[PDB]
Amino acid sequence: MNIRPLHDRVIVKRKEVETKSAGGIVLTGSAAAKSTRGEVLAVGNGRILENGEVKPLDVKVGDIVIFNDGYGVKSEKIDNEEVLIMSESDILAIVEA
Amino acid sequence: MNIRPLHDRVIVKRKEVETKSAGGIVLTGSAAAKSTRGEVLAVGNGRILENGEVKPLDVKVGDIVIFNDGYGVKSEKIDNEEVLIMSESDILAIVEA
Amino acid sequence: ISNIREMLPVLEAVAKAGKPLLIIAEDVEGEALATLVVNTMRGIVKVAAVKAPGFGDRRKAMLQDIATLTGGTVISEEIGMELEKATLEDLGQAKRVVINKDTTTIIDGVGEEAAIQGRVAQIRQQIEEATSDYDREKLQERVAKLAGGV
Amino acid sequence: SEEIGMELEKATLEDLGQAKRVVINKDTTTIIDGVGEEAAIQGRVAQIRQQIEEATSDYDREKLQERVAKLAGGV
Amino acid sequence: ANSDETVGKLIAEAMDKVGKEGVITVEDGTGLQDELDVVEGMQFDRGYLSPYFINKPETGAVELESPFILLADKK
Amino acid sequence: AAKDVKFGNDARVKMLRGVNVLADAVKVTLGPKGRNVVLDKSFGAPTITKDGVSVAREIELEDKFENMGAQMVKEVASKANDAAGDGTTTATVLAQAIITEGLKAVAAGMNPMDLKRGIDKAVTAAVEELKALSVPCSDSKAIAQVGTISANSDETVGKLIAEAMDKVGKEGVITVEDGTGLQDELDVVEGMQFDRGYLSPYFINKPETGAVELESPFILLADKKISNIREMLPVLEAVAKAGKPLLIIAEDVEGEALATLVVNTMRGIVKVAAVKAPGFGDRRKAMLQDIATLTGGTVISEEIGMELEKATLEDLGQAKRVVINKDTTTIIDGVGEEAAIQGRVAQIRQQIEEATSDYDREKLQERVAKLAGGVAVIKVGAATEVEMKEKKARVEDALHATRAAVEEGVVAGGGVALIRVASKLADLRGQNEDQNVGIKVALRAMEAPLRQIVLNCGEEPSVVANTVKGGDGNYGYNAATEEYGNMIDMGILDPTKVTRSALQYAASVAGLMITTECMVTDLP
Amino acid sequence: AAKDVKFGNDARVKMLRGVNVLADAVKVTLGPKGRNVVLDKSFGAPTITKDGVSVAREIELEDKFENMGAQMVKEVASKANDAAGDGTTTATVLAQAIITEGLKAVAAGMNPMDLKRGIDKAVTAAVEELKALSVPCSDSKAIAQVGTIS
Ligand SMILES: Nc1ncnc2c1ncn2[C@@H]1O[C@H](COP(=O)(O)OP(=O)(O)O)[C@@H](O)[C@H]1O
Ligand SMILES: Nc1ncnc2c1ncn2[C@@H]1O[C@H](COP(=O)(O)OP(=O)(O)O)[C@@H](O)[C@H]1O
Ligand SMILES: [Mg+2]
Ligand SMILES: [Mg+2]
């Protein structure tokens, strides 16, 4: 089954644990560090705060995103796959172009 | 590929680790200190806070800025280049003239 | 001397006069020294640095000797002074200096023999009221380093 | 060295030494035939020449003579 | 060496190869006969930091040709 | 401290009483009619032994000078033993002989430095002569004969040694340890096995042995401690799909991981077992590599930047069966092709060549055996502890002499080889007369071991030596049967390397000693 | 430490007095007309015992050689006991007996290593003999007899 994040929470999936390429030709062996990029899988209707109306989120289903990996984020398992649940407050940018 | 900061976040690049000149003729060797100046590469649409409307940021793409280097700021890598991601809350001034 | 900041106003007044500089301080540690070393290396300003003579109380008095011989002004935080507020004028001067692995030597100081002879006439009576045998050796040494030879 | 205020990062190929072959064991590295011109070799040897002259000690003398040999003749 | 022609000869021989600025040291031997080692040029007392570098396991030692050398005066 | 200095014949005389008290305690044990010495111990019961270097190490004398004597000849016996673990009494006997004679000639007023030169020349010559009489010992029978003769004529030791040497092959280790009962027993473990038990007694699928057994199992080699089960999952499940059991040899398996493994194997999920890695420190990783090779698996260490999670079935080693006890894992028949087995063996071949140490040599030879031949253990039987000690020592002793036979050959025992090289050098001469006596001094000592063998039988050394000297080749005196004959045919073989080390070492120190003119030491 | 070495008959005689002091303390206790020995104790009251391995463990002698005698036979009594917890006196008695007689034969000029082989042969044969005389003890009455006689 798939997931449905509650208003303002966003469901994303992590990317590569130090993709062995950085710098150029040199395949940097894992230096004890994690990835901050991720694919957005689902979106909550949007933040309700301050009563009057409910604003959408500025990320769509399937965007590529740099987030801030911190306390806001949680680790979960869907069909046995590594997925994260943070709020848009934690999403920083979108890698495009 | 290039980057697209999420509303209110700003993407900047750092400048010189104690440019060897300060004082005058003397090339001050690195004293264990970093730079607070930087070039603005991308801008988020702007802060959404308090529902009603969404105000732009007062920094444009390509400004030179003094920011406050602190917790608000994060370190990332684009095409293999050292770029930082803080919100306008952390930008203090713009060096012009 | 730990912070190079303390030096800058001075080091640069010297870079403008185009003359080299000796630094005799209580000590020159990591942060300051390193940078001095980097600055002298690149052909910026010709400089050298070397510990002060002896320790304890005589250091200050003996560093004063050095002041007198070269017509400079001792910069201590005791009279409430800062390195930063020191123009070229405070600096001593000589015609040549020579320093080894463990030996600094100043040749021919700018100090007028009016002031040289005077400071010598003071350490003249230091020995007269030196009520000890060890407090007598050092004074006679200094007298020789300022008057005759060793 | 970080003593002259230097960073590894700011080092082009040019800073690197070079040789024709190197051989290293469990406890022995050895460089065969270095690119350094004998102009500079002979010079640095003429410096450690006088290190021994003013080596006022017996133990500060052994090491210098060693190095001379590793740079000039053989061990 | 109390009339030991062989000592005479080995000394003479070493003196000849390491030249005039070369060290000669004596240490216990493995077998019954005296033996003279002469190391050619420059070499010091340091092994690889990981036995993985070893591109020739038959010697148990590392070998590189025309290599650049990075000299870092720091950990 | 103030010293007591002693000069010429005076210092020598004391030196020689010194050599003598030792030499005599050592002699009593020489040959088949050897007798035993008892060496006391503040520890516990005394020690009864026949073993020259054991007696020798104990001798220390009260006369500071006599003592110097003794502490110097003591080294022949000591080196003799570090060199071939046998012949140490013979060694002793030749030195007491080279000294006795040598000194007597310094009293005649020869120049001892020349006495010495001739004694060495004599000896260098004798060693060549031995290499020339030496014939290879390579059938199982001869090997038994060296063992047997080494073990004071214990045919059973000869045999057992010969037997082991046969099964573990040429690159196999043989070790001796106390046995349980009264009779000697030879164990031979087949192929590869090390000192590690299951990490939980729950893995045990066969309680009657008290031990674990798996067939066609995959082998997970992890060069790292295992705490998180997460690290395992991708793997454990690839194995559950192939329906085969799994051995886990890691640096260790602790609480969290282990517990769960234990829970998973229990419920009949996947058949698994786990056991610590062999040894510690640096060899672990190299030795775990051995296991990789034997079973055609890939070591998974965080050193090459590897993660357990990223390991398919392919990385796993494999074998046909494994057997693990309370403290013993053993892998039977690994999948590794003998192309790769033989290769990794050809590497640890030269590990020993450049093993500049004695302890860095033992381990390598062990591994070679666990990968090539087999490992054998002998258990010595004895009624008592006084008995186990002396017997065990002899087996040990002969274990050595056979290893020596095999690498260097055999010559005629009962001191015959030496008595024969002595007539071969009847014509040796040196640069001057003193050296000529010095030569003759050694040739004469060369008779010593046969002379003592005989005297220990209570017959007359110089009648026996005369008749032996009157014969040829390998004619010699059988002390045990008190009859003459061919010593090779009678199986009285000395390993050449020992007969030669006896001569070398005894002359090497006897030589120096007879050139004492002053002796310095402490006041009483 | 400097050592005292003793050879042949000299060393054996000492050896034997050794065996003897020990053997004789242990013997007084053999059989139903056994008597007791008293072994002192720095601890508290002495110990009266009939039990050969108890007496044996105490004997240590002042002559270092007589002592080696005693410390050697002492293991027969000791092993006998680890093996069946009984018969330790008898064992001691037999050894003193094998030794006495044997040494007497070494003095006759026999070759001890053979004296030994013959003693062992004699024994391996005796042990077979014993297994032959042995009849099972399996009723309660016989068990009580071994108990009782023990
Ligand atoms: N029946 C025999 N006749 C003569 N010599 C024998 C006989 N059996 C063994 N030997 C000899 O015993 C000598 C050494 O035995 P051993 O007492 O251990 O002296 P070591 O400690 O010097 O090995 C060897 O030279 C061997 O040839
Ligand atoms: N009435 C008896 N007549 C003869 N021997 C006896 C008698 N009772 C017991 N024994 C014997 O006593 C011997 C040993 O008793 P003990 O003094 O305990 O010696 P140990 O310590 O050697 O057991 C045994 O041989 C047993 O046969
Ligand atoms: Mg032997
Ligand atoms: Mg009883």
From Swiss-Prot, chains A, B:
GO terms for biological process: chaperone cofactor-dependent protein refolding; protein folding; response to heat; virion assembly. It is found in: Cytoplasm. Activity of the GroEL-GroES chaperonin complex requires Mg-ATP. One of its GO terms (molecular function) is identical protein binding. GO terms for cellular component: cytosol; GroEL-GroES complex. It holds the Pfam family Cpn10. The keyword Transport does not apply. The keyword Chaperone applies. Keywords: Chaperone, Cytoplasm. PROSITE patterns: CHAPERONINS_CPN10. The modification N6-succinyllysine is found at residue 34. Together with the chaperonin GroEL, plays an essential role in assisting protein folding. The GroEL-GroES system forms a nano-cage that allows encapsulation of the non-native substrate proteins and provides a physical environment optimized to promote and accelerate protein folding, probably by preventing aggregation and by entropically destabilizing folding intermediates. GroES binds to the apical surface of the GroEL ring, thereby capping the opening of the GroEL channel. Regulates the ATPase activity of GroEL. Heptamer of 7 subunits arranged in a ring. Interacts with the chaperonin GroEL. Can form asymmetrical complexes, composed of one GroEL and one GroES, and symmetrical complexes, formed between one GroEL and two GroES oligomers. The asymmetrical complex is the functional unit. It was suggested that the symmetric heterooligomer may represent a transient intermediate in the chaperonin protein folding cycle. Another study shows that the symmetric heterooligomers are substantially populated only in the presence of proteins that cannot be folded by the chaperonin. Belongs to the GroES chaperonin family. This is Co-chaperonin GroES. It comes from Escherichia coli (strain K12). The lineage of its organism: Bacteria, Pseudomonadati, Pseudomonadota, Gammaproteobacteria, Enterobacterales.
Curated annotation (Swiss-Prot), chain D:
Phosphorylated reversibly during heat shock. Can be UMPylated on a tyrosine residue by SelO/YdiU, probably under stress conditions. The modification N6-succinyllysine is found at residue 20. Transmembrane segments: none annotated. It is found in: Cytoplasm. Belongs to the chaperonin (HSP60) family. Together with its co-chaperonin GroES, plays an essential role in assisting protein folding. The GroEL-GroES system forms a nano-cage that allows encapsulation of the non-native substrate proteins and provides a physical environment optimized to promote and accelerate protein folding, probably by preventing aggregation and by entropically destabilizing folding intermediates. Each subunit is composed of an apical domain that binds non-folded proteins and GroES, an intermediate domain and an equatorial domain that binds ATP and is involved in inter-ring interactions. Forms a large central channel that appears to traverse the entire length of the cylinder with no obstruction. The central channel of GroEL functions as two cavities, one in each ring, that are separated from each other by the crystallographically disordered 23-amino-acid C-terminal segments of the seven subunits. The entry and exit of polypeptide seem to be restricted to the apical end of each ring. Modulating the volume of the GroEL central cavity affects folding speed in accordance with confinement theory. Small proteins fold more rapidly as the size of the cage is gradually reduced to a point where restriction in space slows folding dramatically. For larger proteins, either expanding or reducing cage volume decelerate folding. A stepwise reduction in cage size results in a gradual loss of cell viability. This is Chaperonin GroEL. The chain holds residues 302 to 376 of 548 of the full protein.
From Swiss-Prot, chain G:
Phosphorylated reversibly during heat shock. Can be UMPylated on a tyrosine residue by SelO/YdiU, probably under stress conditions. The modification N6-succinyllysine is found at residues 33, 50, 116. ATP binds at residues 29-32, 50, 86-90. The modification N6-acetyllysine is found at residue 116. It is found in: Cytoplasm. Forms a cylinder of 14 subunits composed of two heptameric rings stacked back-to-back. Interacts with the co-chaperonin GroES. Can form asymmetrical complexes, composed of one GroEL and one GroES, and symmetrical complexes, formed between one GroEL and two GroES oligomers. The asymmetrical complex is the functional unit. It was suggested that the symmetric heterooligomer may represent a transient intermediate in the chaperonin protein folding cycle. Belongs to the chaperonin (HSP60) family. Each subunit is composed of an apical domain that binds non-folded proteins and GroES, an intermediate domain and an equatorial domain that binds ATP and is involved in inter-ring interactions. Forms a large central channel that appears to traverse the entire length of the cylinder with no obstruction. The central channel of GroEL functions as two cavities, one in each ring, that are separated from each other by the crystallographically disordered 23-amino-acid C-terminal segments of the seven subunits. The entry and exit of polypeptide seem to be restricted to the apical end of each ring. This is Chaperonin GroEL. The chain holds residues 2 to 151 of 548 of the full protein.
